[PDB]
Design an enzyme around this catalytic site. Structure first.
Site, mmCIF file in Angstrom:
data_model
loop_
_atom_site.group_PDB
_atom_site.id
_atom_site.type_symbol
_atom_site.label_atom_id
_atom_site.label_comp_id
_atom_site.label_asym_id
_atom_site.label_seq_id
_atom_site.Cartn_x
_atom_site.Cartn_y
_atom_site.Cartn_z
ATOM 1 N N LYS A 7 30.592 33.058 40.227
ATOM 2 C CA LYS A 7 32.457 33.136 40.853
ATOM 3 C C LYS A 7 32.997 35.258 40.856
ATOM 4 O O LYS A 7 34.022 34.396 40.836
ATOM 5 C CB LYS A 7 32.755 32.882 38.657
ATOM 6 C CG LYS A 7 34.639 32.175 38.620
ATOM 7 C CD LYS A 7 34.924 31.453 37.455
ATOM 8 C CE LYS A 7 36.667 32.553 37.259
ATOM 9 N NZ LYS A 7 36.656 31.018 36.761
ATOM 10 N N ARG A 10 32.995 35.163 44.458
ATOM 11 C CA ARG A 10 34.144 34.493 44.410
ATOM 12 C C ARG A 10 35.257 34.998 44.621
ATOM 13 O O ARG A 10 36.251 34.995 45.154
ATOM 14 C CB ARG A 10 34.765 32.987 44.364
ATOM 15 C CG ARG A 10 35.678 31.842 44.959
ATOM 16 C CD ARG A 10 35.491 30.089 44.775
ATOM 17 N NE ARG A 10 34.866 30.054 42.943
ATOM 18 C CZ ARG A 10 36.231 30.630 42.884
ATOM 19 N NH1 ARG A 10 37.454 30.047 43.270
ATOM 20 N NH2 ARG A 10 36.279 29.562 40.620
ATOM 21 N N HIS A 12 36.536 37.796 43.196
ATOM 22 C CA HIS A 12 36.663 39.627 43.461
ATOM 23 C C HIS A 12 36.135 40.620 44.767
ATOM 24 O O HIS A 12 36.678 41.417 44.827
ATOM 25 C CB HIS A 12 36.013 40.633 41.900
ATOM 26 C CG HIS A 12 36.793 39.748 41.023
ATOM 27 N ND1 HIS A 12 38.563 39.826 41.022
ATOM 28 C CD2 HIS A 12 37.022 39.387 40.131
ATOM 29 C CE1 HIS A 12 38.562 39.249 39.893
ATOM 30 N NE2 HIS A 12 37.804 38.480 39.470
ATOM 31 N N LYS A 41 47.752 31.558 39.515
ATOM 32 C CA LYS A 41 46.635 32.406 38.921
ATOM 33 C C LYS A 41 47.790 34.204 38.857
ATOM 34 O O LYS A 41 47.525 34.934 39.803
ATOM 35 C CB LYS A 41 45.246 33.047 39.306
ATOM 36 C CG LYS A 41 44.620 34.161 38.698
ATOM 37 C CD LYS A 41 43.120 34.596 38.957
ATOM 38 C CE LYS A 41 42.727 35.985 38.018
ATOM 39 N NZ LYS A 41 41.118 36.121 38.587
ATOM 40 N N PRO A 42 48.098 34.636 37.751
ATOM 41 C CA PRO A 42 48.879 35.940 38.286
ATOM 42 C C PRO A 42 48.211 37.387 38.727
ATOM 43 O O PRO A 42 49.950 38.253 39.609
ATOM 44 C CB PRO A 42 48.934 35.837 36.358
ATOM 45 C CG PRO A 42 48.077 34.929 35.847
ATOM 46 C CD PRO A 42 47.489 34.488 36.369
ATOM 47 N N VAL A 43 47.727 37.415 38.765
ATOM 48 C CA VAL A 43 47.168 38.805 39.040
ATOM 49 C C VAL A 43 45.386 39.022 39.096
ATOM 50 O O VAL A 43 44.766 38.155 38.706
ATOM 51 C CB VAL A 43 46.707 40.223 38.216
ATOM 52 C CG1 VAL A 43 48.685 40.014 37.252
ATOM 53 C CG2 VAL A 43 45.808 40.044 36.505
ATOM 54 N N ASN A 44 44.768 38.985 40.526
ATOM 55 C CA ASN A 44 43.716 39.525 41.041
ATOM 56 C C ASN A 44 43.688 40.168 41.753
ATOM 57 O O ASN A 44 44.218 41.379 41.742
ATOM 58 C CB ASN A 44 43.634 38.205 41.738
ATOM 59 C CG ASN A 44 41.825 38.164 42.031
ATOM 60 O OD1 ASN A 44 40.919 37.850 41.021
ATOM 61 N ND2 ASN A 44 41.157 37.920 42.879
ATOM 62 N N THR A 45 42.089 41.123 41.343
ATOM 63 C CA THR A 45 41.730 42.232 42.545
ATOM 64 C C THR A 45 40.634 42.124 42.967
ATOM 65 O O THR A 45 39.140 41.155 42.775
ATOM 66 C CB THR A 45 41.748 43.095 41.838
ATOM 67 O OG1 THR A 45 43.188 43.597 40.823
ATOM 68 C CG2 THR A 45 40.957 44.474 42.451
ATOM 69 N N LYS A 66 37.935 46.328 27.467
ATOM 70 C CA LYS A 66 39.831 46.604 27.343
ATOM 71 C C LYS A 66 39.435 45.383 26.553
ATOM 72 O O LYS A 66 40.485 45.816 24.799
ATOM 73 C CB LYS A 66 40.979 45.486 28.129
ATOM 74 C CG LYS A 66 41.110 47.004 29.105
ATOM 75 C CD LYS A 66 42.089 45.629 30.549
ATOM 76 C CE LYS A 66 42.820 47.165 31.649
ATOM 77 N NZ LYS A 66 43.647 46.122 32.319
ATOM 78 N N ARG A 85 49.239 39.959 43.004
ATOM 79 C CA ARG A 85 50.514 40.020 41.514
ATOM 80 C C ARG A 85 51.374 39.322 42.606
ATOM 81 O O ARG A 85 52.261 39.391 42.599
ATOM 82 C CB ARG A 85 50.825 41.669 41.400
ATOM 83 C CG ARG A 85 50.510 42.502 40.843
ATOM 84 C CD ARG A 85 50.640 43.694 39.932
ATOM 85 N NE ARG A 85 49.479 44.481 39.442
ATOM 86 C CZ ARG A 85 49.141 44.174 37.797
ATOM 87 N NH1 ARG A 85 50.258 43.051 36.927
ATOM 88 N NH2 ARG A 85 48.039 43.911 37.720
ATOM 89 N N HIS A 119 32.808 39.526 35.376
ATOM 90 C CA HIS A 119 34.153 39.882 35.232
ATOM 91 C C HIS A 119 34.731 41.298 36.115
ATOM 92 O O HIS A 119 34.353 42.018 35.402
ATOM 93 C CB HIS A 119 34.664 39.768 34.191
ATOM 94 C CG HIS A 119 35.631 40.407 33.374
ATOM 95 N ND1 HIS A 119 37.270 39.894 33.236
ATOM 96 C CD2 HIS A 119 35.761 41.785 32.583
ATOM 97 C CE1 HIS A 119 37.730 40.283 32.527
ATOM 98 N NE2 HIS A 119 37.557 41.579 31.912
ATOM 99 N N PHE A 120 35.948 40.938 35.947
ATOM 100 C CA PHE A 120 36.801 42.655 36.719
ATOM 101 C C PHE A 120 37.688 42.668 35.176
ATOM 102 O O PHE A 120 38.803 41.746 34.996
ATOM 103 C CB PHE A 120 37.172 41.762 38.069
ATOM 104 C CG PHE A 120 37.942 43.783 38.919
ATOM 105 C CD1 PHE A 120 39.341 43.746 38.419
ATOM 106 C CD2 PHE A 120 36.959 43.623 39.118
ATOM 107 C CE1 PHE A 120 39.246 45.122 38.977
ATOM 108 C CE2 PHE A 120 37.657 44.994 40.352
ATOM 109 C CZ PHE A 120 38.626 45.991 39.962
ATOM 110 N N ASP A 121 37.340 43.980 34.603
ATOM 111 C CA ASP A 121 37.752 44.440 33.232
ATOM 112 C C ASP A 121 39.549 45.493 34.165
ATOM 113 O O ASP A 121 40.546 45.193 33.695
ATOM 114 C CB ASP A 121 37.528 45.145 32.750
ATOM 115 C CG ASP A 121 37.665 45.290 30.924
ATOM 116 O OD1 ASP A 121 38.403 43.988 30.620
ATOM 117 O OD2 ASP A 121 37.936 46.318 30.582
#
Length: 124
Positions: A7, A10, A12, A41-45, A66, A85, A119-121
């Protein structure tokens, strides 16, 4: 079902490009990686580095995530990333995003054996 590690790849990883090449990068990637299937999805890097370089972050600088968890790690080096964004015109299923390219340190949460990013923090 899809693993946390898969995941993460996929959502990030984009080893195929060194940077976003146009303002449409996010719209195309969010869609293609299936991040807008159920909702926008609101935000993704997305990180433009080799998988090995990002997996290595799990053995770099331990920092609190965080949310307070202590399984986060910050990259010693800056990395090429693309921030996505959602825009004011975004409307499911026509999700729309603003693309921002930058070189920043990334913070990921790691888990498992092998111990990899799940996870991307944040980017700092």
């Amino acid at each position: 079902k899809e693993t946390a590690a898969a995941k993460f790849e996929r959502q990030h990883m984009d080893s195929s490009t060194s940077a976003a090449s146009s303002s449409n990068y996010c719209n195309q990637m969010m869609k293609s990686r299936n991040l807008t299937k159920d909702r926008c999805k609101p935000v993704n890097t997305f990180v433009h580095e080799s998988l090995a370089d990002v997996q290595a972050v799990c053995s770099q600088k331990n920092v609190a995530c965080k949310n307070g968890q202590t399984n986060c790690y910050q990259s010693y080096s800056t990395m090429s990333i693309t921030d996505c964004r959602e825009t004011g015109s975004s409307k499911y299923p026509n999700c729309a995003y603003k693309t921002t390219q930058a070189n920043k340190h990334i913070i990921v949460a790691c888990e498992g054996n092998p111990y990899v990013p799940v996870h991307f923090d944040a980017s700092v």
